[PDB]
Amino acid sequence: ITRTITSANIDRLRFTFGVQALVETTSKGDRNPSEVRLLVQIQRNGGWV
């Protein structure tokens, strides 16, 4: 997903992310935790960082 910033006077930017769920269910019915990964990118110079 991408959006652009247009305001003039800003000093910091905060990103609110998250997951809807992480439970992993086994065949028997046991539930185990999982993991996920994200990256936050800002277009400095000409390439995303």
Partner: protein, 147 residues
């Protein structure tokens, strides 16, 4: 409803969230494995629901109304699985089961299952293939021996 209280005691605008506590669901499928003179009922659910325990009601004849099940039938007991071994369970006749899940919070609706004991008589008799001796025949058949 959660509200934030200041240090001076004031209360902010409320925020709300709603949840529901629900009675357990009825069993989806009931597995019936015939035995010698016994039938074993192992209920299963789509969802795990560790709290649930199953309630078994045994009936010789099929019940027309589910509401009538509680009164007419007999209360076998509550467990994860049940076995019904007795003289009355016979291979010829059919027998009906009624199962409902029970929690601390509530109970589900009755579910019906039909089962019968094993009929593979020859497989059972294969255990006694060679061990029948003269002792096992009756008097009406020993007079054959003398004759």
């Amino acid at each position: 409803t959660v509200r934030a209280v200041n240090a001076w005691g004031q209360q902010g605008d409320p925020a709300s969230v709603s949840f529901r506590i629900a009675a357990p669901a009825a069993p989806s499928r009931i597995e019936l494995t015939p035995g010698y003179f016994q039938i074993t009922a192992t209920p299963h659910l789509a969802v795990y629901d560790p709290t649930v325990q199953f309630e078994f009601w045994f009936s010789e004849k099929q019940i027309a109304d589910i509401r009538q099940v509680e009164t007419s039938t007999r209360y076998l007991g509550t467990a994860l699985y049940w076995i019904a071994a007795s003289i009355n369970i016979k291979p010829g006749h059919d027998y009906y089961f009624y199962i409902r899940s029970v929690n601390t919070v509530g109970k589900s609706a009755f579910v019906e299952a039909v089962g019968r004991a094993s009929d593979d008589a020859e497989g059972y008799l294969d255990f006694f293939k060679g061990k029948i001796t003269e002792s096992h025949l009756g008097k009406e058949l020993l007079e054959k021996v003398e004759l």
